[PDB]
Amino acid sequence: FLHVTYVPAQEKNFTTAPAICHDGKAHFPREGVFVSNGTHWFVTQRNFYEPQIITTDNTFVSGNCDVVIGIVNNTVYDPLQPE
Amino acid sequence: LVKQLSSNFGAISSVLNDILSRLDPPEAEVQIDRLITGRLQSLQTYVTQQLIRAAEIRASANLAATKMSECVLGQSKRVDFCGKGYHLMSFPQSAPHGVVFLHVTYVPAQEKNFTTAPAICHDGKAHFPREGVFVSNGTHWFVTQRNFYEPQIITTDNTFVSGNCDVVIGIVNNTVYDPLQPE
Amino acid sequence: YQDVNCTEVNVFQTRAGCLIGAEHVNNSYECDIPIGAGICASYQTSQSIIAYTMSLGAENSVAYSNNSIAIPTNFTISVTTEILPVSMTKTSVDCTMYICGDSTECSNLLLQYGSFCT
Amino acid sequence: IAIPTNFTISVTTEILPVSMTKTSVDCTMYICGDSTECSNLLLQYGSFCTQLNRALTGIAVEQDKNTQEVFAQVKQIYKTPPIKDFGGFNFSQILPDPSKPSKRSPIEDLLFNKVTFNGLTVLPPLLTDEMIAQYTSALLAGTITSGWTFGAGPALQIPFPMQMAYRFNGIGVTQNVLYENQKLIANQFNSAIGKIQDSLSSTPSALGKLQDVVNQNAQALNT
Ligand SMILES: *[C@@H]1O[C@H](CO)[C@@H](O)[C@H](O)[C@H]1NC(C)=O
Ligand SMILES: *[C@@H]1O[C@H](CO)[C@@H](O)[C@H](O)[C@H]1NC(C)=O
Ligand SMILES: *[C@@H]1O[C@H](CO)[C@@H](O)[C@H](O)[C@H]1NC(C)=O
Ligand SMILES: *[C@@H]1O[C@H](CO)[C@@H](O)[C@H](O)[C@H]1NC(C)=O
Ligand SMILES: *[C@@H]1O[C@H](CO)[C@@H](O)[C@H](O)[C@H]1NC(C)=O
Ligand SMILES: *[C@@H]1O[C@H](CO)[C@@H](O)[C@H](O)[C@H]1NC(C)=O
């Protein structure tokens, strides 16, 4: 047999956070990790670094802002408001 | 094994009482030694064969236990492990020295061919299907599943944007409307 | 006859040996009774016995393009049986009885062989 | 947390036997070859000969059965298109070569090259090497032109880049990665296949798992 596989190559270090508090409500990523480059917070998949702006469609709200541990504060973009 | 008792193995007879009821002990012992050698060898080979068969039976029983656990207590994604096709569920039945499984599968029947496209360019940005594949009948473009044809109208919740229209090979122009635009 | 030509012994020569009593056929079918080296035989009609080359099945090519797909429109649910032995018939023997049934001297002679019985 | 920013695609090899060489022995010939007195003496030992012959025949039929079980899983025979266009991918190393008298791939040819009367005989396998190669080529054509569908029902055709994109989607990676790194991925795949072709030879410790089978059979017969 000639198996064909996939292997990650080059890594980088980032700062993460389990959840983000916006308006007294916690936010969790649907599929991905909350990563930061030291200035802004993005969400990206797990096996290939590809950041994107945190919106209301790639995350879901669940609970309050005083239960989870390690939650941070940031701004959650809203897509339909400019339109 | 039972029939092996009728062979004299070189002695003057194959029946112990007759052997010992005609001769003195000094020679009856020689004859009896010959018979016991033969019979011990026969019993030995029978036992060895039984051990070797028991190993295979145990392997089959382990396979049956794994199949029961993984396809009667749940749904399996190992292809051709519990029947040909996409496995749904299974039922066990008893039998003499074994079991019988009634696998229930799902097989597509009637296929029709269309034309596809890896991406759809709308306004200089590419579009990819969230789940499914883009299909067309030659006059309009739809997105559908991959195992049961069911077209749907292309819009902004079935697709996600990524990159531009100058990187993908095979991209095709088409409109992708916003549901909130008519309203 | 296995591994011999039709000289030492209707009559046909195969890769496995001399075959007597069958008629060779140019056609190919599915194997019924294996013979060897891809040859098989079966009883098909005037009923007789024919020897033919094994066939792997029906040839089928798929119209591969670079912008075409095929999608099912109707399905089918089926049932198949799978059969698996689980246990064998358990038994046991009495070595000394089987070897020297009701014979004290025979059992005494058997005693000089060790723990084979155990 | 650490997140990879680039990837690699690689190819490996896995070798494992399926069957050994079937054989048979004529008990009476081996023990008392052409001797009526010796046969008469042997008649006083029961059914040892019949037991041994039955065991050997069972072994031979099991060997044929397991070879058939490994290879003959599909019945329909598929064929690759005459025009080789798979979006940059190159399967020339694995597809069969028509010019060769035996329609087998160069890798199969290299593998074939690398591996080397007292009542006992050797019987031929029921399934021949050309038939096995035809099975392998049919499986390869089916998987390159259809995907996994030809093993679950009627073979449906899909473009190969789209099949690759689906398989990327199967390990949690979105398809745009393939759709915008197609050329690089194809180059890396072809280079890896070439590396395997080179590295398969030039090492006398790779086909040991088959050489040992051959050696054990030969040694048993010799002793
Ligand atoms: C798609 O539309 C754009 C903008 O109108 C155009 O530049 C491009 O050539 C079109 N694609 C094809 C294949 O013609
Ligand atoms: C048997 O006959 C065939 C042709 O009939 C011949 O090719 C072969 O050499 C012969 N073998 C022996 C051992 O006579
Ligand atoms: C492959 O797809 C491209 C996409 O435009 C098309 O131009 C071409 O005719 C197709 N076939 C071949 C053999 O390139
Ligand atoms: C699917 O097949 C069944 C019988 O196999 C048939 O009754 C049914 O009409 C078919 N479905 C369609 C949409 O034709
Ligand atoms: C990522 O690594 C792969 C593995 O060699 C290589 O093909 C590709 O060029 C790399 N990407 C770069 C250097 O941007
Ligand atoms: C594919 O590989 C073969 C040998 O590795 C080479 O001769 C050929 O040019 C390559 N490309 C195509 C399109 O066949």
Side-chain angles (χ1 to χ4, degrees), chain A residues 9-10, chain D residues 6-8 184 188:
Chain A
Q10 306 168 5
Chain D
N6 181 6
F7 59 89
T8 62
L184 177 72
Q188 292 189 16

Side-chain angles (χ1 to χ4, degrees), chain D residues 84-85 88-93 190 193-194:
Chain D
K84 309 303 182 298
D85 181 10
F89 294 82
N90 195 340
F91 302 104
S92 58
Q93 296 285 307
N190 298 337
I193 292 284

Side-chain angles (χ1 to χ4, degrees), chain D residues 134-145:
Chain D
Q134 267 165 54
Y135 278 152
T136 293
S137 65
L139 274 160
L140 195 59
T143 178
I144 67 180
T145 60

Side-chain angles (χ1 to χ4, degrees), chain B residues 7-65:
Chain B
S7 42
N8 56 6
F9 288 101
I12 69 169
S13 191
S14 62
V15 56
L16 213 65
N17 300 276
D18 188 0
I19 289 181
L20 57 86
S21 72
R22 271 165 36 177
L23 277 296
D24 306 327
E27 315 153 1
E29 63 91 16
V30 160
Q31 313 297 325
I32 286 174
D33 185 77
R34 195 189 318 273
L35 282 71
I36 67 186
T37 52
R39 298 185 174 172
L40 195 55
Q41 179 184 354
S42 175
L43 199 56
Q44 190 68 253
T45 186
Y46 167 78
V47 173
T48 302
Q49 292 279 1
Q50 288 290 332
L51 277 171
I52 305 179
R53 293 177 183 176
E56 177 190 1
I57 292 296
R58 174 182 45 193
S60 171
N62 284 286
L63 179 56

Side-chain angles (χ1 to χ4, degrees), chain B residues 128-134 143-146 158, chain D residues 162 166 175:
Chain B
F128 302 75
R130 200 157 291 177
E131 58 88 20
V133 64
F134 284 136
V143 60
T144 191
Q145 295 178 357
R146 314 159 198 169
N158 306 328
Chain D
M162 304 189 39
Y166 278 6
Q175 57 253 15

